Amino acid sequence: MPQPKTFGELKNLPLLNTDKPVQALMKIADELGEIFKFEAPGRVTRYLSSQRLIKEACDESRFDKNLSQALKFVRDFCGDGLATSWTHEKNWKKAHNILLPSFSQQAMKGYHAMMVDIAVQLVQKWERLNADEHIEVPEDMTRLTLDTIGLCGFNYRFNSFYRDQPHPFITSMVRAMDEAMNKLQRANPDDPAYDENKRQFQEDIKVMNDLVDKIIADRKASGEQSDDLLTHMLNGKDPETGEPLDDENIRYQIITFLIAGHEVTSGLLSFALYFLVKNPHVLQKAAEEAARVLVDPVPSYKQVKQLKYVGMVLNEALRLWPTAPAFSLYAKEDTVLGGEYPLEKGDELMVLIPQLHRDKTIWGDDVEEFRPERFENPSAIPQHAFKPFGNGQRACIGQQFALHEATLVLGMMLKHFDFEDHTNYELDIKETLTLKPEGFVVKAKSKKIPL
Ligand code: HEM
Numbered sequence: 042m043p044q045p046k047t048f049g050e051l052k053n054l055p056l057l058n059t060d061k062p063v064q065a066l067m068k069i070a071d072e073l074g075e076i077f078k079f080e081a082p083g084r085v086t087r088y089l090s091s092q093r094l095i096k097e098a099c100d101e102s103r104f105d106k107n108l109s110q111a112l113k114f115v116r117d118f119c120g121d122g123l124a125t126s127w128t129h130e131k132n133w134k135k136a137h138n139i140l141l142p143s144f145s146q147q148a149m150k151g152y153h154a155m156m157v158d159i160a161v162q163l164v165q166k167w168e169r170l171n172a173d174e175h176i177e178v179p180e181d182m183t184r185l186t187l188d189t190i191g192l193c194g195f196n197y198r199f200n201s202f203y204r205d206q207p208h209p210f211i212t213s214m215v216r217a218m219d220e221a222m223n224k225l226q227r228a229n230p231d232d233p234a235y236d237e238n239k240r241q242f243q244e245d246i247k248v249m250n251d252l253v254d255k256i257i258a259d260r261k262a263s264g265e266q267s268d269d270l271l272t273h274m275l276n277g278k279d280p281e282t283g284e285p286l287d288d289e290n291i292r293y294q295i296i297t298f299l300i301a302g303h304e305v306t307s308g309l310l311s312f313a314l315y316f317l318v319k320n321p322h323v324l325q326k327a328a329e330e331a332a333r334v335l336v337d338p339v340p341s342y343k344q345v346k347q348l349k350y351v352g353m354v355l356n357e358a359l360r361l362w363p364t365a366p367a368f369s370l371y372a373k374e375d376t377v378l379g380g381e382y383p384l385e386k387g388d389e390l391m392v393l394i395p396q397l398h399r400d401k402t403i404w405g406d407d408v409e410e411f412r413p414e415r416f417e418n419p420s421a422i423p424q425h426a427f428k429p430f431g432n433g434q435r436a437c438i439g440q441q442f443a444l445h446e447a448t449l450v451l452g453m454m455l456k457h458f459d460f461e462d463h464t465n466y467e468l469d470i471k472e473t474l475t476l477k478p479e480g481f482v483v484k485a486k487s488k489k490i491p492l
Pocket residue numbers: 106123124125137297298299301302303305306309363364365367368369428429430431432434435436437438439440442443444
């Protein structure tokens with residue numbers, strides 16, 4: 042099975058020593074095909090890029106979520122949070138059972154008001170820009186998604202729209218993600234040259250924890266009951282174990298939720314807006330839906346649900362640029378992938394989601410084309426062709442949350458503003474552990490529809 046270029050005893054790893062690893066892996070997948078072996082010092086994985094192989098990798102009886110090395114280093118501050126837990130860790134299923142009810146569509150009804158609060162701030166920010174002033178979309182979308190998660194996660198207002206510099210927690214979080222990412226390429230981590238990087242990391246860990254732990258201490262001491270995630274975690278009992286989440290895990294979940302609602306959802310929104318400004322027909326179509334559906338000053342939960350084409354737009358953005366572009370799997374037992382690639386128990390797989398979503402055998406040759414109409418009816422989408430939210434029980438618990446928020450804000454965006462790609466913006470995808478269109482800027486001309 043094919044393997045990309047090697048670097049001596051570093052094997053393929055230097056390939057990831059790049060600003061854009063996911064995009065690097067995508068061009069490799071284009072070159073080598075539906076599967077290529079990727080080796081690193083003391084590490085081997087197989088990057089899947091075809092729906093044919095990924096539908097099998099997505100067989101949960103055969104493959105379980107693996108923690109990529111990224112998630113393992115993110116586990117250093119997300120602990121046994123849902124996303125950095127192994128399926129077999131008691132806390133995963135515990136936290137999964139406790140939180141699944143907090144992430145359903147019906148759960149969204151409760152979060153809708155808080156999402157709108159933040160969404161209106163975004164709209165008001167843009168309403169208040171001066172002529173010829175532009176929007177830094179990614180930046181503003183991150184302000185929105187991070188504040189949405191804060192408010193919805195634990196009634197905390199990061200007030201990102203009141204800031205140029207991010208909240209101290211977010212400075213530490215983003216810094217720890219960068220350390221986690223950087224340390225994929227670190228051969229000798231204990232080298233003194235990384236003393237301060239590691240000290241900085243422990244500073245960032247100790248920072249996020251104390252700040253999140255206090256918020257949990259604040260809530261439990263005040264004894265107040267909001268309708269946010271944190272209430273559900275303080276009061277939730279895992280029906281299986283019967284146990285509630287202990288404080289350490291709740292904190293890990295909060296940190297987990299804050300990261301997932303940071304640049305991962307923000308990315309979708311930024312990619313969506315990019316594609317909408319690059320495809321005005323799509324924009325017109327989405328904006329006319331937003332105008333037809335969002336007939337009230339502030340969107341209702343039910344109106345957001347009726348933003349079908351906006352959801353299609355989001356799905357098509359998720360197709361071309363899944364902002365969580367990969368998830369790792371391991372073979373629970375000896376198995377053969379596709380009848381071609383024998384896998385031993387424990388062998389690791391990587392689902393290169395952007396590449397899957399470019400599977401011409403599933404979507405046709407125009408995979409690069411942004412056409413939300415691909416998602417007119419989800420029944421036309423084959424099993425496991427579209428996995429921007431992962432797979433099975435380890436799929437994104439926050440998918441409904443992310444889509445409701447993104448549809449909401451996008452709907453409101455299209456309702457209240459005509460958008461101009463005033464720079465003929467050249468899509469430049471910055472890669473952290475998520476994808477975002479770097480330097481994506483637009484001008485938003487208010488439609489002068491009051492809020
Ligand atoms: C469009 C935005 C989002 C995308 C594309 C996305 C994508 C994904 C993907 C692919 C996974 C599976 C990861 C894996 O298997 O390793 C996942 C897991 C997860 N996501 Fe999201 N996600 C998004 C938004 C959110 C938000 C807003 C939250 C906030 C709660 C969230 C929370 C989680 C959690 C907790 C997991 C782990 C679930 C589990 O393992 O049980 N995500 N996400």
